[PDB]
Design a protein around this ligand. Structure first.
Ligand code: 45L
Length: 330
């Protein structure tokens, strides 16, 4: 089997991407945020505290003939941006792009934090990191990909995120028409539950390539590119007027400035992030100060290849017995 679904930015800045997901019988279609940095599939639901729901589409398990309470199960998750959600669990049929899993753990939110309430476009998350990060207790549950894996033609999924445009998640196959050149594969550590790998270095604009190991995660659920402070300083030093602002919480620049590209290494291969990808617009409406898409990972504890980086590439998440990551230009 295979599946193929279109993923769509939620706003004009590509702050996140939503993918339609069919849950239950008859199908309830929810728009979920596919997140290779977490491992819970959770949704706004009929059980979510009423005051915390504002425009989201909800899953109602009582209306699904295939929904079964996972008795005694609870879940509770906190994300890197300080947001959080929690609730109980049902198993139900879940389909993505024609690929169907039965008995998928669907985590029903009883509580979500303010940032989820305030974003009407995201109806929940679909985690695609390793199942060892799943928060369901007392019995940890498997991700959609983990459950689908044995049935897939090939044990892989791919992320092809668009720049200010729709893209694609495929399951079970590699679309050889979706990238240029070759796919370069690189080693993955699963020890922290993430798609964790080591970049071979970077360059800024037309600058020479600095060979240096940068350990980080491929994380579709994170908007920006977070790298060591040395690397980020070297990037913004090439942008006239750029400054790190403690009041804003990162690097900002005048948008009258032209942004250089940023290149990262994948083995001997190179992925080039165009300068325009690194522009996240005015810090507040009407402001001439724009927020940077490359920020310091200092204090996060880990480097994060988020959407800014991944949308410059065709990315293979290879879930073979020994997992690997593949990157191609496109
Ligand atoms: C590195 C890290 C730490 C905490 C949460 C996340 C996550 O959920 N990413 N989408 C990632």
């Amino acid at each position: 089997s295979t599946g193929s679904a279109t993923t769509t930015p939620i706003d004009s800045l590509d702050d996140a991407y939503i993918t339609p997901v069919q849950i239950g019988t008859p199908a309830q279609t929810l728009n979920l945020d596919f997140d290779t940095g977490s491992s819970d599939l959770w949704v706004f639901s009929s059980e979510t505290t009423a005051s915390e729901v504002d425009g989201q589409t909800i899953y109602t398990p009582s209306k699904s003939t295939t929904a079964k309470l996972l008795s005694g199960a609870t879940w509770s998750i906190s994300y890197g941006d300080g947001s959080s959600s929690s609730g109980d669990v049902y198993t139900d049929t879940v389909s993505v792009g024609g690929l169907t899993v039965t008995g998928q753990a669907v985590e029903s939110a009883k509580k979500v934090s303010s940032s989820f309430t305030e974003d009407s476009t995201i109806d929940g998350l679909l985690g695609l990191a390793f199942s060892t990060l799943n928060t369901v207790s007392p019995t940890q549950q498997k991700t959609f990909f983990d459950n689908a894996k044995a049935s897939l033609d090939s044990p892989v999924f791919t992320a092809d995120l668009g720049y200010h445009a729709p893209g694609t998640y495929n399951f079970g196959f590699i679309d050889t028409t979706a990238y240029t050149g070759s796919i370069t594969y690189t080693a993955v550590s699963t020890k922290q539950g993430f798609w964790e790998w080591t970049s071979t270095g970077y360059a800024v604009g037309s600058g020479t390539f600095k060979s240096t190991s940068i350990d980080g995660i491929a994380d579709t659920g994170t908007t920006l590119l977070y790298l060591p402070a040395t690397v980020v300083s070297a990037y913004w030093a090439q942008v006239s007027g750029a400054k790190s602002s403690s009041s804003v919480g990162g690097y900002v620049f005048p948008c009258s400035a032209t942004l250089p590209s940023f290149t990262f290494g994948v083995g001997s291969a190179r992925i080039v992030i165009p300068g325009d990808y690194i522009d996240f617009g005015p810090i507040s409406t009407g402001s001439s100060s724009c927020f940077g898409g490359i920020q310091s990972s200092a204090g996060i504890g880990i480097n994060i290849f988020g959407d800014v980086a991944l949308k410059a590439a065709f990315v293979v998440f290879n879930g073979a017995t020994t997992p690997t990551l593949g990157f191609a230009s496109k």
